[PDB]
Amino acid sequence: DLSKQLDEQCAKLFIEWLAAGGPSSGAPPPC
Amino acid sequence: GATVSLWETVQKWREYRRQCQRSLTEDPPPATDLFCNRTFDEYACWPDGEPGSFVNVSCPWYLPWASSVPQGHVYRFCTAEGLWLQKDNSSLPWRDLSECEESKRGE
Incomplete structure (x- = not known):
């Protein structure tokens, strides 16, 4: 509910980071 | 249990990269002089x-919500000029990710 709702949130955050360019984006990896 | 989890999503991404970088280096050259070159972005x-032309590929299978977007394509x-398009004031090339994004509540 909180621990299992933060990992689905981290995966959205990870996909968003990948969308921006991943390593090439300049933004640090999410979690 | 309900979430795919950060570990499983990143792990599925690593395999998608692994299969990609395989194809990228072992797939036979096109032999048609001018073409946009293969890549993993x-x-x-x-x-x-x-x-x-417009080039399309399925939504990346490692996506948490991949099940929710099965007829989707990224463009x-x-x-x-044999170059992937790049619009005014940009560095990352033009891409339509639309059919592959998540979308909120309903069903």
């Missing part, structure tokens, strides 16, 4: 493009 695997435009 961190998100998707792109093949060699045909000039003056690029390969120019006549």
Whole structure:
């Protein structure tokens, strides 16, 4: 509910980071 | 249990990169002189493009919500100059990710 709702949130955050360019984006990896 | 989890999503991404970088280096050259070159942009695997056309690939199978977007496609435009399109004031090339995004509550 909180621990299992933060990992689905981290995966959205990870996909968003990948969308921006991943390593090439300049933004640090999410979690 | 309900979430795919950060570990399983990143692990599935690593395998998608692994299969991509395999194809990128073992797939036979097009042998048609002008074409946009194959690439892995961190998100998707792109093949060699045909000039003056739109190139499409399925939504990357590692996506948490991949099940929710199975007829989806991510797009690029390969120019006549054998170059992947890049719009005014940009560095990352033109791409339509639309059919592959999540979308909120309902069903």
